[model samples]
Target: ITGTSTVGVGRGVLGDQKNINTTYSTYYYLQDNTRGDGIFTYDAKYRTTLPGSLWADADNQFFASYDAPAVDAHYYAGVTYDYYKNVHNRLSYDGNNAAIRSSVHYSQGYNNAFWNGSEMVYGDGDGQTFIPLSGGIDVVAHELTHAVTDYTAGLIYQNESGAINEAISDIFGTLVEFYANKNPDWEIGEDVYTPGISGDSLRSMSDPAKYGDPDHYSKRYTGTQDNGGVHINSGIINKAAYLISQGGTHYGVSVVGIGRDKLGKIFYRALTQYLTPTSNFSQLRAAAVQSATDLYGSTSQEVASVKQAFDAVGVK
Candidate 1:
């Protein structure tokens, strides 16, 4: 049993209560350098050094480094853990008492960040284009959400399944972002990219069409570019969830927010409880509507609003 690793070491919303220790190792290398960048920094009170590599079996075989401790890796991991526990009643990355691990500042000028099955791996951006990927809570949550999706839906990342997988991550990734920042209009990865880049978001939530490509689904669209534009086509599902949750007038009819939190609850229920490997757009509509009805009742405005939003998005 690994001991807890917390950033603030205090008691608050952002503070740790229980002595939560993870078994897996955490390594932090230099943000931009590759070789000889494995040394640990002694500037922070909460910093500690892990032995040899993260998976070393022999003595003097430390393979990972724990350098910069001021980064948000700890906070990101904490937010992700708390979101799953509070929002979905999930325990950890696996939902079954699993230890979560993360590696930060991976490889020089590495532009992309991702979550492997057991851990989150981050790269320092090219500096000119972006900063370290681990700097944002939402980006961290977004990557971790992919692991959650794999555990639950395992939506074979292709076609509709791929779209759902990507959509699911974006949905809760934004939710976690909103949760952490308490921002009324939170968008995922908005803070990670360089400020000057045009249309630079990892993906658009409010309007995927704004990024340009296609506003609506086209049969001619085969799964190309990142599992058939799962990240790109995700606009459809994202807007559906947003419109349903945020409350907006469809054409002329009014669909108001019964409450954003309530809508998120319903959507989370549908995604985790009712969705499956083969679930598609229409299926998602039915499941979400059903979940909303179950939670808010059929006559409730929230249920009607959610369904209407889905309808407006052509999900039904």
Candidate 2:
């Protein structure tokens, strides 16, 4: 809807207060015009229909319990858009000023969120497994990064390539979290996952093995399920990314930390310039090393650390 841009205050699913961008005409709609072309949020209303309806409120204040998820979804999308544009110098998911769209409250007890090749979709969660996944900035960024991957490397969505794709999403997602500086950690989906349990997450990049995910290449899952263990085997790459950002010793190998900024630069370069649809773990290692070499000299510690991180995770 065409309207003047306005700001609205609301509390997110986790009870954090923040301001969200909205459009105002007769009523306020969850549409942010400040980023790229625009950022729009819609309500699924517990139905399978997508982008159901533009969320509208009589007042610009969004304090109702039902508005929590929509507020987070809309606000986080803007944040994610800012991260990509400011940090990466990329306009949007497609490297163009594309309009970003998202829908929340997808289905009752729907416990997962995904990018359906075009836009983002989120589930309200069963409250046991998750609680309105968009409440987690990492989760929102993770799904949006999929669209980034689709446009860039175009990695296949199965087996090794798929794991690489998933890891790319996780990597940028963590970077976006750190960029936001909001109680950032190396854990994914920690904010909105398992409300009953504290200190647990959907996945742990710092320690993939903490959640039964393989931290080493030798332990990778080869099963056909889960798109050939895309989520499961991504742990190997996630561990490598963590080791690069924060030095660690894993399986008798040591990696010197290069911090998050350099880690993102190296990975982003690799994703945009080197990776392909069928690139696997070994190929990713080469791409990272070359990317680091390009950014910093081949003899620089950045390149050495990239090598060490992949070696520590058995990617070599």
Candidate 3:
């Protein structure tokens, strides 16, 4: 929609008040023109259509319960955009400031979210196991990072590569969460997952094994489900990443934490410069090591911690 850039006040799915960049044309539309080409949010209307319709509001005030998902979807997309641009110095997902778009309320009783190669889709949960997923910034960042991964490493979504893909999402998801400073933790989907329950999430980056996910290479799942346990096995990499940032002992090996900023720098370089479509676990270890070496030198503590974190997770 062609209109002047404007700000709209709204309450997100979590009932938090925030302002979003919207467009004011015939009506207030959830089309932000401040970043990149634009950030657009759509109302899926409980269907599977792609980018159903650009959300419209009468007074530029979105407070209705039905408008909750759109509020967060639009707002978080901007935050993720800022994270990439300001933190990583990368324009949108493609590094070309590509238009960012998303749709919410997808499918009836839907309990998941995904980036379908072009845009993002979020489900309005069944009100038990989950809620509107866009409420979770990590979830939003996770899906959007998938777009980043697609444009970069282009890691194949299968086997070890798939697990690395998932881990990368979780890794950046948690990083973006910390960047935003919104009750940041090493957990994914906690804000929107299980509205009826507290202190639980879909995945844990710090202690993947807490949720029955493997935190070591030798314990990885080798089954045919979940694209060769992509989600399950990501725990190994997630744990390694957590150790790289926070430093801890795993299976008798200890890593000297290098903090989150260096962790992100090393992994971002690895993903953009060294990783390929078929890179496996060992390959990821090498890429990360070389990435740290490139940024902090071969003898730097950053490089040593990278190697130790991978070794602690049995990646070598």
Output the number of the lDDT-best candidate.
Answer: 3
Candidate 3 at residue 167, lDDT? Answer: 98
Q: Which RMSD does model 2 reach against the true structure?
A: 0.8
Task: After the best TM-score superposition of candidate 1, give how far the Cα of residue 154 lies from its true spot, in angstroms.
Answer: 1.7
Rank ordering of all candidates by TM-score, starting from the highest:
3, 2, 1
Writing each residue's lDDT as its tens digit, candidate 2 over 153-179 gives: 999999999999999999999999999
Clashes of each: 10, 0, 0
Every candidate's lDDT: 0.60, 0.94, 0.95
Model 2, runs deviating above 4 Å: none
Q: Which scores greater on lDDT, model 2 or model 3?
A: 3
Off by over 4 Å in 3: none
For model 3, name the residue pairs that clash: none
TM-score of each: 0.76, 0.99, 0.99
Q: TM-score of predicted model 2?
A: 0.99
Model 3 per-residue lDDT tens digits across residues 125-156: 99999899999999999999999999999999
